[PDB]
Each structure stands twice: as structure tokens, then as C-alpha cells.
Ligand binder design. Structure first.
Ligand SMILES: *[C@@H]1O[C@H](CO)[C@@H](O[C@@H]2O[C@H](CO)[C@@H](O)[C@H](O)[C@H]2NC(C)=O)[C@H](O)[C@H]1NC(C)=O
Ligand SMILES: *[C@@H]1O[C@H](CO)[C@@H](O[C@@H]2O[C@H](CO)[C@@H](O)[C@H](O)[C@H]2NC(C)=O)[C@H](O)[C@H]1NC(C)=O
Ligand SMILES: *[C@@H]1O[C@H](CO)[C@@H](O)[C@H](O)[C@H]1NC(C)=O
Ligand SMILES: *[C@@H]1O[C@H](CO)[C@@H](O)[C@H](O)[C@H]1NC(C)=O
Ligand SMILES: *[C@@H]1O[C@H](CO)[C@@H](O)[C@H](O)[C@H]1NC(C)=O
Ligand SMILES: *[C@@H]1O[C@H](CO)[C@@H](O)[C@H](O)[C@H]1NC(C)=O
Ligand SMILES: *[C@@H]1O[C@H](CO)[C@@H](O)[C@H](O)[C@H]1NC(C)=O
Ligand SMILES: *[C@@H]1O[C@H](CO)[C@@H](O)[C@H](O)[C@H]1NC(C)=O
Ligand SMILES: *[C@@H]1O[C@H](CO)[C@@H](O)[C@H](O)[C@H]1NC(C)=O
Lengths: 346, 214, 370, 50, 198
């Protein structure tokens, strides 16, 4: 592997280099915030409406209340993560109908009323790029109860007591939060992050930003058209990069794939025998007497409980990682959208 | 005799059980013909030693359009001592016998539909396996040498014969041309479509790419 | 479910609702013949262990409670099944193997055993799913002068595979000198007879062994039990007994593509999805009965006792039978809270932008809102 | 051992999960080292005058 | 004559993979960062490297911390001597006391003792008659050895799952520390930090 291109700075004690021109550039940062909320029932998974298995499971212990409490805490933690990241503005601001923000376009990020969901062009591309699976209660007990020639994994996990709870905030409310934050940022600056929103023209706000980064404000007012054209070209390049390449959102896609493969492994662990004569409780209860079927049912109960505990522990570790990423995203929203940041490479 | 050699391609796929599966990638361990193996091509011409060892399963194929193959004889030895299987076909019904009377006191007899339903090239495929005392017969009729493609074989005929088989021959009514393939215990990855049939398969011990696929 | 007498404000997942089955159906094939276990047990003489018989039992109704009257044994030795549950389920093919061995050799008729009978005479597979019946016969297999008609093999070049025979009588050649039939010092006949006298102890007496082998399989069933059938009912949560498998679900007509040899379907979790009716050759899907989760929305117990109940994921035309006001939500059907057109802060979260609260109207009640 | 391998195959599918977790851990540590140290685009060099 | 623990864990299927970046590449990365810092300042972290004399760079740093730049140019030799004495004191403190790298030594010790107890878990019976499989195969028939093998399989599977869970928790802690180190490298080496005690 090559670490990089070889360079050597011409250092001298009476030589300096000072730039004569600039470049406005727009980058992209993608951060996971929340993950899928799952609800697991022990009686459908381990036993599945078997009275003997239910009696031995009640005779076993109280691990299932602990697993239920853990999954409930994970779900409330996901809702709290979304509320902490997005709900940071007191009032839903609105842009004026006139869209002349000092020569800056801002049309690709502001919403439009043509779509039923008030989302912008870039938000529509980001929502179309992720192939979302297990979005909530989309099956609604109607497609699984019917006759399908090719059954999918969703009905297979649905019939075994593994369900997915919908998020508390819909995508319309998240888009409303994002539109309010964008409207406050364009029409106010950093003044809406401290108290009431105070209006200011966007050219004077950008001059304030240049004074923040250490450049005198006469540079902007004599080069406003070039900076506006550079911003518009950067937004167009962001549009083209999000239209062409489909590998940029591989954190959110990895989150979706990890949840899907965890649920699929939890379903596929039901076919194991775990040392018993069969993996079906009905065949064991029909083929044997009371004591031997009790032994095989106890073995299958122990194996399925170990599988469920492994799933819950992995979900807890992943929820901790997702909570750390959501805290980072909330800090970035508080420090960079609501104000100008002096931290290097933040 | 005119012994020749030919690649097997992917002509050794059969249904492992009698359970319907749809849109499921399934892994099975059974006696299978390996992919790109070596089958033996025989040209029986009568104006030759047809005795071949069994070795845990036989894949049989023939490209003859005309009905010139009558059946097969099996068994460890054919000196009218032990039980030797015999299939007689006359394009009206099939006749199965177990007793030691060879080609011109029998326990099991079986009369059903003839194995030659069709009268293009009409490639015929047969897989004979003797596991747990059952003579499993798998057959498939493919209207097309061995082509490139997949054709799963259905267990339509089973025999509860329970004998020992080491040698086998064929029956003629000469311009015969048949292929013989040998089965080895391998692990496959069978793919079922929406209609429930096997369309693709992967041999897990062929190359590292297929091992990665498995 | 909280192990307490006071419940705070919030939403709690209490239990899961299920639809109970109504009827019970049994589907068995149209078989009326009787299986001849009488010809197996009530017999004049048996065969030797090196030449053990095998009788095929098929296309009959098997009653396993009449076996105890034919022979005076103690109990069954069943592997994989139980002897008292042999009538509530059924197989495809049943065999019966009869041979006479010594009392010390009865323990070698178990799967996984190694010895003299279990290596050179009669080997059982390690996946045996049958029963072994053995009883003492010292009055019909023993003579004061000698019953030498029972033979067994001591010498063999290799070991027997499971379920195979060897009735060949050739002179074993253990030495390096070939003889080809000369019974010299290096060649012995591997076929010796038991010297049965009535004046032995209990360990060396002859024993008659009958081994039953079962073939529970996806093949169509031919040997079944004395249980009557029931008329088929569809589109109803019932209990079914299709050829010995027990389950609960709703049976509907199928548009599947079952091949003529396939008789069952399966799921990724290895549970049955479709089953073929043995009487008429049709395919029925097995869909489980209606279920789901139940959540309880309550205020504090010190505040009030009014309860709104949410059924998670279902629509309100699917509820089996709480409250009076019925509201539809993308999370499920909420019963007991009226829907207002106003919008306030979220008090009790429900899902998909819907919250619930305990507020007045003019008369306290639970309301739901966006 | 053949018998232990057969019983472990008959047991379940925990080992693929363990191997997947360990592989994810190792890829995570490689990502950690890359994101800590590889922060500069080009390899600079000091002049011989010090 | 005296086998180490490395062969004992290698013979039981416990291996260690090499890192993707060798120590030479990490040394080259740190040398490039040091050269860019002492030649250009913070200008190599925003765009291209911009050369500047080191006296003017330290005047930039003093103007950053709130001190006028005439303090440096009248006290340049004293500040240079103080910095050289500070580097000599770091050299003496690193040569004398070896307890400064206790975090890295504890990481190495934790991984070594985890692998050591994973090896030592193979000598336990877990309720069976022996801790070795070959004596179980040789002493017993199929049926009893299946039960004892199942018991040993359950015990070793539980031990492996415990090791994997502890490794996952330790890897999460190491990832948090690596994120902190990356933030410190971005904010303090590539620029000047105004945060107190960062
Ligand atoms: C702001 O950007 C949008 C998007 O590029 C511009 O809309 C385009 O306008 C051209 C010419 O009017 C059309 O050919 C394109 O089809 C439009 N694209 C879309 C997506 O609508 C818009 O013109 C820009 N604003 C200004 C003032 O130029
Ligand atoms: C600073 O850079 C900008 C581009 O980054 C230069 O603007 C370009 O100038 C050329 C020559 O006049 C034009 O052909 C381009 O169309 C301009 N681009 C844009 C986006 O306006 C600018 O000239 C540079 N300034 C100096 C002093 O070199
Ligand atoms: C089969 O083996 C023979 C040698 O025994 C060889 O010449 C021939 O090429 C092989 N056939 C193949 C590889 O298809
Ligand atoms: C009939 O077959 C049996 C073996 O199946 C053999 O022992 C017997 O000798 C045969 N009968 C005649 C007359 O050959
Ligand atoms: C079949 O016969 C051969 C001798 O020709 C013998 O070695 C073998 O054990 C027999 N049984 C089989 C292959 O099951
Ligand atoms: C399944 O069978 C139907 C019936 O002819 C056919 O239309 C369809 O193409 C088949 N599916 C595939 C994948 O070939
Ligand atoms: C098979 O079962 C059906 C069930 O109704 C019955 O009508 C039919 O007569 C049976 N067939 C025979 C041959 O008994
Ligand atoms: C068995 O049944 C027969 C009828 O065929 C009967 O005569 C006999 O007494 C019974 N008992 C014995 C021990 O044979
Ligand atoms: C519930 O049932 C109604 C009435 O059949 C139907 O219109 C609706 O689509 C179903 N699903 C939901 C989610 O309401």
C-alpha cells in the first residue's frame, strides 16, 4: 500500500506563502442516529402455543421478564436518541415566499409542496437510496394470514413472535424539524440558537462568517457573485454525486442489514435439534411418553433460551454503539448548524 | 467397446427428499455426481466386457432417440446364485424381477408404466442408488452429448429389494452409446425457485469460489 | 404483570391475545385391513440369527395392544418412540425380524453395540427408530437330547453393515495355507450350533427376539392405527391430525405446485407449511390462528382507573371481540380513547406520531391525538 | 474428532455468529488505526537544514 | 524443553492476525505529521501546506493564547532553551520510570490473560468423567460417550461465548478511546485548541 504522494515543503527563515484566491466547497457527513425497535415474545418463540412447554418454561425461571425489559429499554432509548438529535428547535420556522437569499439558490434543500411528504430533492434521493426493510407494522397481519406462493422472511419471523415496533416520530415530523432548522439557519444565523430569532440579510450573515474565520468582510462584498456561483456548483456536484454513486450510505445500509440478519439468524435457530430427537415440539409430544418428552422439551427450551439471550446481548451492544453515534450527531447539530465552530476538522 | 471420456458438466442433480420447498437456498449432504467430473463413454457394437463395478451409485445417460435399450441387470454375481435385478421394457409396461434367472422362485414383482414415455434428440437420464436396502431410481426426460444446463431428477420409482449389488450391465435388443457416472458423498447448495423445482446448484468442493459461495 | 398494586402513568405490554380453536379433525387414509402380527408371534418355529427372516407389513390397520396376548414377555424395548404411544401416530412401512439367540446376547440387539451378534450376525443401524421384543422360550427351543437347529457365525473377514444378510456357507481360511474345503488346523467352518439343554441357568437359555422397524417418512402412509376420521373443515381455526402430526391453524385451499411424489411442505424454521390430505389428493396450507400483542395505556392509579387497550399491529376489522371508542392507528387498533382534532404535547407515547393523555372535555376521559 | 464434529453440527449455528463477531472486531481495530493515524493526504519531509 | 503458552494456544485453534499497518507505516505517518506541523503550522490541515518561519509560527500561537507577539521576539532564546530543557526532562522521565505506558501494558496483559484462561478452560470436566475426548471415545460405547461429549460441548461453547462477549465489550471501550485519540489529533496537532484542559 502507498501511504500517499511524496511532498517536501520549501522551508526557509525568510520565505512565506500567502494565498491569493479561495474555493468554497460542500462536503457530506452521514451519521447513524436510531435503529430498529424489536419486540420478542417467549411463548411463541420457545414454545409456540404448547401447554407442556409453557408449564416447563414457567417451571424454569424468570429470564423472559429480563429480556422483555432489556428490549423495551432499547426501544425507548431509540426514541430518545431521535428526539435528542432532531428536536432542538422551539418553534417551527418558515421561509418567506421570496427566495432571493443574496444570490444563493437554496432550492435543492428547501422543501416543495408538490410531494405529499414535504421533503426536498436531496432528502428524496437519500430516502430512495436506502432499501429499507422492516419499516414497522407494514404487513399489518393481512398479507401473512393470506395465501402467498412465495413466503418471505417477514411472515416467517412474524409467526414466531418476533415483531417490529414503529418509531414514535414519523418521517413527516423529521422533515418538519429539518425544514424548521434550515429556515432558522438561513433567515437568522446563530441568533435562533440562543434566544429569539433575529433577522439579518444573508450577505451580511456570510460576512459575519468570514469575520469569524479570520478574513475581513471586504473580500465577500467584492466577490459575492463568485462565491454564490461556487456554492451553486458545489450543490450541483453534491446532487450528481448522490445520483451516481450508491455506496455513500453504507452506514445506514449496514444498520438495516445487521438488524435483518440478526432477526434471520434468530428465526433459523429454531430448526436446530440441540441434541434432541426432533426440532418440533408436536412430534416429540406425540412420539414419546411424559418423562422423555419432558427431557427433550427441556433440552430445546435451554437451547432456545441461550439463542435468545445471545440475541439480546448483541442488541444491547449495538444499541450502545448507536447511542454513542446519536450523541455525536446531536453534538454536531448543536455546534455546527446552530453556530460557527472553531474546532479543527469537526 | 470404444472407451472414451467426457466432462460431466452439471448433469447429476436430483431431489434429496420428498418435501416441497420454494424460494429457499438449501444445503444437503448426499451421494452426488461431482461437477465437471469424468464419465465413461461406451460404444457397444455386436457383430466386449460390459461388467462394471457399482461403487456407491451409478449415473446413467443415453442419447438414443430410438427405443433400443431394454433394461439393466444388477447384482454382485450373475452365475444364477444370488438375487439379480432385471428390468424388461417392451414399450407397453415395465417388468421388474429379483430372482436369479438371467436374460434368455421370484420374491418381488412390479408392473407399472414403461420408462420410455417419449418416442429433437430425447436425452434420457438415470441415477441408481442403493442406500439402506432401497433401490432408488431417479429419472428425467430432456428433449435437446451432455449439454450445458440443469435438470433435476425426481424419485418416481422405488424398490424395497434389499440385496447386495456390486456389478451391473445393460440389455440390448449394435450401435449403443451410453455414459456411466459415479457418485461420491458431496455437499451441494440447491436453489429452489417460486415453482418449487431445482434450477441451480453449487458443488461446495470444486474450487475455492464455490466454497466461498457455500 | 408488574407484581405491584399501584401502576404509574405510561404504556405497558401486558400479555398476548390468541384465538382459540373450535373443532378438532382427524385425517387418516381409507385402509380397512388388519396387520398380521399373529402370524409373526404365534409361530411353530423361528429362524437362526445368521438367516433371520423379514416380513413386510403394509396396507393394514395395526393394533399394538394385542401384542401382549401373543407372547409372554415383560415389556417393550423401544428406541425413538414409546410403546404406549404407538396408536396415536403412524408410519409408512413396518418390518418384523425373527431370530433366536442366547440370553447373554440380548443386549447386542441395541443400536451402537459391538460384539458377536452385533458384528457378524445381525447389526442394527445407529438411527434405529423401532422396538425390540424378547422373551424366554425354554419349552419350545430346547431338548433334553439337544436342539442343534439354531446356528450362529463366529468367523468373518469383515463386519456387517446395518440391515444386511449373509447366508453363504464357505470354509473360513484364517491361516496362510489355502485349503478350499479341507477342514484342517488352519481352516474352520464358521457355523456352530447352540447346545441347548433344559438344565442350564437363566443366562444360557434360548430367547426368541422379534424386532420391529418403523419408517416414519414423507411417503404416503400404509400402516396406521385404529382411529376414526373426521370431515374436513376449511377457513376455521381448528386442530388437525394429518397422518400423525398434531397442530393448530387455519386450513385454506392452495394454488401451489406440489409434485406427485411430494406430500409435505416446510418453512425456514422447519415447521410444516402445507400438508396433503390422505383421503383426497389436495394441498392445504397451514396458516396459524390470529394472534398479536396487547398494550395497556393507563394514567396513574391514584388519578383514575380508566384503561385504554391497544392491540399492536392489527386493524379494527380483525379484532376478535377495553373500551367503546374505536380508533385506527398505524401502530395498531386503539380501543377506549376518543380521537380529538387538537394537538398538544406528548404525554403517553403510542407510535407513528400518536400520543394519549387524560384530559377533560367540558367528564374526565382518555383522549388520543397527533 | 468425528463424533464431536457431528454433534456440534447437530447442535446449532452459534459458531458462525462468533466468527462474524470476531471478524467485525478485527475490521473495527483496523479502521481505528486508520482513522487515528492516516489523517494527512501527503507525506511531507523536513529539509536537511535543521 | 519448556513449551510456551503461544504454542499451547496455537495448537488449540486460537490464532492472532497481524495488523494491516506495520510499525514503519505508522512511523512514516507520524513523521509526515511532525514535518507538516513544524514546517507549515495549521495550514496543512485545511488545504495545501504553506511555509512559514518557526518564529512567526510561535508568534501566531502566542497571539492565539492572548499574548502580544512582541513578547516572543524579545524572549526567543529563553523560550527555546526552556523548550529544549523540557524535551530533555521528558527524555529523563521516560528513561527513569517505566510506569507511564501502563494503559498499553494493561491492554496487552488483558488480551494475554483472556487467551490464557480460554486455553485453561479446556482442562475442566464440566460434569463428565474426563476432560479429554479420546478417553471418552475409548472407554465408553456410543450412547454414553454421546452424553459426555454433549456435556463437554456445552461447557466449551459457554466458555467461548463468554470470551466473545468480553472481547466485544473491550473492543467497544477501545473504539471509544480511539475516537478520543482521533479527535485530539485533529484538534491539537492540526491546529490550536481553545478548550480548557483538552
Ligand atoms: C436552483 O437550482 C435548481 C436545480 O438545479 C434550478 O432548477 C433548474 O432550472 C433549469 C433552468 O430553469 C431547468 O432546466 C432545470 O430542469 C431545473 N431543475 C430542477 C430540478 O428544477 C434553478 O433554476 C436554480 N435557481 C436559479 C435561480 O437558477
Ligand atoms: C479565483 O478562482 C475563480 C474560480 O475558482 C476564478 O473564476 C474563474 O475565472 C475564469 C477567468 O476569468 C473564468 O473563465 C471562470 O468562469 C471563473 N469561474 C467562476 C466560477 O467564476 C477567478 O478568476 C480566480 N481569481 C483570480 C484573481 O485568479
Ligand atoms: C478423464 O480421464 C482421462 C484419463 O483417465 C483423461 O484423459 C480425460 O481427459 C479425462 N476427462 C475429462 C477431464 O473430461
Ligand atoms: C429358490 O430360491 C432360493 C433362494 O431365494 C434358493 O435357496 C432355492 O434353491 C431356489 N429353488 C430352486 C428350485 O432353485
Ligand atoms: C456385498 O458382497 C461383498 C462381496 O462380494 C462383501 O464384501 C460386502 O460386504 C457385501 N455388502 C455390502 C456392499 O453391503
Ligand atoms: C413458474 O411456472 C409458471 C407456470 O407456467 C411460469 O409462467 C413461470 O415462468 C414459472 N417460473 C419461473 C421462474 O420459470
Ligand atoms: C378412499 O377414501 C374415500 C373417502 O371418502 C372413500 O370415499 C373411498 O371409497 C376410499 N377408497 C376406497 C378404495 O375404499
Ligand atoms: C399361537 O397361535 C396358534 C394359532 O395359530 C395356537 O394354536 C397356539 O396355541 C398359539 N401359541 C403358541 C405358543 O404357539
Ligand atoms: C383493515 O381492514 C379494512 C377493512 O377490510 C381494510 O380496508 C384495511 O386495509 C385493513 N388494514 C388496515 C391497516 O387498516
Amino acid at each position: 500500500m502507498s501511504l500517499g504522494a511524496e511532498n517536501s515543503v520549501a522551508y526557509s527563515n525568510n520565505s512565506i506563502a500567502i494565498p491569493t484566491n479561495f474555493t468554497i466547497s460542500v462536503t457530506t457527513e452521514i451519521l447513524p442516529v436510531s435503529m430498529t425497535k424489536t419486540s420478542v415474545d417467549c411463548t411463541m418463540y420457545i414454545c409456540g402455543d404448547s401447554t407442556e412447554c409453557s408449564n416447563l418454561l414457567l417451571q424454569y425461571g424468570s429470564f423472559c421478564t429480563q429480556l422483555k425489559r432489556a428490549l423495551t429499554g432499547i426501544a425507548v432509548e431509540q426514541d430518545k436518541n431521535t428526539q435528542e438529535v432532531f428536536a432542538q428547535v422551539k418553534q417551527i420556522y418558515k421561509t418567506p415566499p421570496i427566495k432571493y437569499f443574496g444570490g444563493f439558490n437554496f432550492s435543492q434543500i428547501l422543501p416543495d409542496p408538490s410531494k405529499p411528504s414535504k421533503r426536498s430533492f436531496i432528502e428524496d434521493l437519500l430516502f430512495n437510496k436506502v432499501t429499507l426493510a422492516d419499516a414497522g407494522f407494514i404487513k399489518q397481519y393481512g398479507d401473512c394470514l393470506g395465501d402467498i406462493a412465495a413466503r418471505d422472511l417477514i411472515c416467517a419471523q412474524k409467526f414466531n413472535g418476533l415483531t417490529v415496533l414503529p418509531p414514535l416520530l414519523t418521517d413527516e415530523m423529521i422533515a418538519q424539524y429539518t425544514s424548521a432548522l434550515l429556515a432558522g439557519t438561513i433567515t437568522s444565523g446563530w441568533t435562533f440558537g440562543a434566544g429569539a430569532a433575529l433577522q439579518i440579510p444573508f450577505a451580511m450573515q456570510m460576512a459575519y462568517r468570514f469575520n469569524g474565520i479570520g478574513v475581513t468582510q471586504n473580500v465577500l462584498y467584492e466577490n459575492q457573485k463568485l462565491i454564490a456561483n461556487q456554492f451553486n456548483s458545489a450543490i450541483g456536484k453534491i446532487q450528481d454525486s448522490l445520483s451516481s454513486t450508491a455506496s455513500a450510505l453504507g452506514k445506514l445500509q449496514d444498520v438495516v442489514n445487521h438488524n435483518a440478519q440478526a432477526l434471520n439468524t434468530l428465526v433459523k435457530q429454531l430448526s436446530s435439534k440441540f441434541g434432541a430427537i426432533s426440532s418440533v415440539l408436536n412430534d416429540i409430544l406425540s412420539r414419546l411418553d411424559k418423562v422423555e418428552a419432558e427431557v427433550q422439551i427441556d433440552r430445546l427450551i435451554t437451547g432456545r433460551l441461550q439463542s435468545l439471550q445471545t440475541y439480546v446481548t448483541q442488541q444491547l451492544i449495538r444499541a450502545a454503539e448507536i447511542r454513542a453515534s446519536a450523541n455525536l450527531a446531536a453534538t454536531k447539530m448543536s455546534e455546527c448548524v446552530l453556530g460557527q465552530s472553531k474546532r479543527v476538522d469537526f | 467397446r470404444t472407451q472414451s471420456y467426457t466432462n460431466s458438466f452439471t448433469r447429476g442433480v436430483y431431489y434429496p427428499d420428498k418435501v416441497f420447498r420454494s424460494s429457499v437456498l438449501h444445503s444437503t449432504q448426499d451421494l452426488f455426481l461431482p461437477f465437471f467430473s469424468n464419465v465413461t463413454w461406451f460404444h457397444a457394437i455386436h457383430v466386449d466386457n460390459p461388467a462394471l463395478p457399482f461403487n456407491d451409485g451409478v449415473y446413467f445417460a443415453s442419447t438414443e432417440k430410438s427405443n433400443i435399450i431394454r433394461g439393466w441387470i444388477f447384482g454382485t454375481t450373475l452365475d444364477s446364485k444370488t438375487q439379480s435385478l432385471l428390468i424388461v421394457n417392451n414399450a407397453t409396461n415395465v417388468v421388474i424381477k429379483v430372482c436369479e434367472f438371467q436374460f434368455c422362485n421370484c420374491t418381488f414383482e412390479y408392473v407399472s408404466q414403461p420408462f420410455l414415455m417419449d418416442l429433437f434428440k430425447n436425452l434420457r437420464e438415470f441415477v441408481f442408488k442403493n442406500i439402506d436396502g432401497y433401490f432408488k431410481i431417479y429419472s428425467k426426460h430432456t428433449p435437446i452429448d451432455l449439454p450445458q444446463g440443469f435438470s433435476a431428477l425426481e424419485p418416481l420409482v422405488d424398490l424395497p429389494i434389499g440385496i447386495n449389488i456390486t456389478r451391473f450391465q445393460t440389455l440390448l435388443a449394435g450401435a449403443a452409446a451410453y455414459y456411466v457416472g459415479y457418485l461420491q458423498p458431496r455437499t451441494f447448495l440447491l436453489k429452489y425457485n417460486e415453482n418449487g423445482t431445482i434450477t441451480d446448484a453449487v458443488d461446495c468442493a470444486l474450487d475455492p469460489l464455490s466454497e466461498t459461495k457455500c | 404483570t408488574l407484581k405491584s398494586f399501584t401502576v404509574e402513568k405510561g404504556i405497558y405490554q401486558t400479555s398476548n391475545f390468541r384465538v382459540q380453536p373450535t373443532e378438532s379433525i382427524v385425517r387418516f387414509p381409507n385402509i380397512t385391513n388388519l396387520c398380521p402380527f399373529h402370524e409373526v408371534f404365534n409361530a411353530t418355529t423361528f429362524a437362526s440369527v445368521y438367516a433371520w427372516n423379514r416380513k413386510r407389513i403394509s396396507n393394514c390397520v395395526a393394533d399394538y395392544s394385542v401384542i401382549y396376548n401373543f407372547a409372554p414377555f415383560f415389556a417393550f424395548k423401544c428406541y425413538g418412540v414409546s410403546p404406549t404411544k404407538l396408536n396415536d401416530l403412524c408410519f409408512t412401512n413396518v418390518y418384523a425380524d425373527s431370530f433366536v439367540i442366547r440370553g447373554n446376547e440380548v443386549s447386542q440387539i441395541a443400536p451402537g453395540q459391538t460384539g458377536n451378534i452385533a458384528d457378524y450376525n445381525y447389526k442394527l443401524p445407529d438411527d434405529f427408530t423401532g422396538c425390540v421384543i424378547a422373551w424366554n422360550s425354554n419349552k419350545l427351543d430346547s431338548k433334553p437330547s439337544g436342539n442343534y437347529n439354531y446356528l450362529y457365525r463366529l468367523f468373518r473377514k469383515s463386519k456387517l453393515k446395518p440391515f444386511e444378510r449373509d447366508i453363504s456357507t464357505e470354509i473360513y481360511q484364517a491361516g496362510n495355507r489355502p485349503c478350499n474345503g479341507v477342514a484342517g488346523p488352519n481352516c474352520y467352518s464358521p457355523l456352530q450350533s447352540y447346545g441347548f439343554r433344559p438344565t442350564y441357568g437363566v443366562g444360557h437359555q434360548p430367547y426368541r427376539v422379534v424386532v420391529l422397524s418403523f419408517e416414519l417418512l414423507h411417503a404416503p402412509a400404509t400402516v396406521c392405527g385404529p382411529k376414526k376420521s373426521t370431515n374436513l373443515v376449511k377457513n376455521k381455526c381448528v386442530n388437525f391430525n394429518f397422518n400423525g402430526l398434531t397442530g393448530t391453524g387455519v386450513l385454506t385451499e392452495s394454488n401451489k405446485k406440489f409434485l406427485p411424489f411430494q406430500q409435505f411442505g416446510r418453512d425456514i424454521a422447519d415447521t410444516t407449511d402445507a400438508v396433503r390430505d390422505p383421503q383426497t389428493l389436495e394441498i392445504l396450507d397451514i396458516t396459524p390462528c390470529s394472534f398479536g400483542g396487547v398494550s395497556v395505556i393507563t394514567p396513574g392509579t391514584n388519578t383514575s382507573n380508566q384503561v385504554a387497550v391497544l392491540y399492536q399491529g392489527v386493524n379494527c376489522t380483525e379484532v376478535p371481540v377495553t373500551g367503546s371508542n374505536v380508533f385506527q392507528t398505524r401502530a395498531g387498533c386503539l380501543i377506549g380513547a376518543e380521537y380529538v382534532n387538537n394537538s398538544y404535547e406528548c404525554d403517553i407515547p403510542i407510535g407513528a406520531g400518536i400520543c394519549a393523555s387524560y384530559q377533560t372535555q367540558t367528564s374526565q376521559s382518555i383522549i388520543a391525538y397527533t
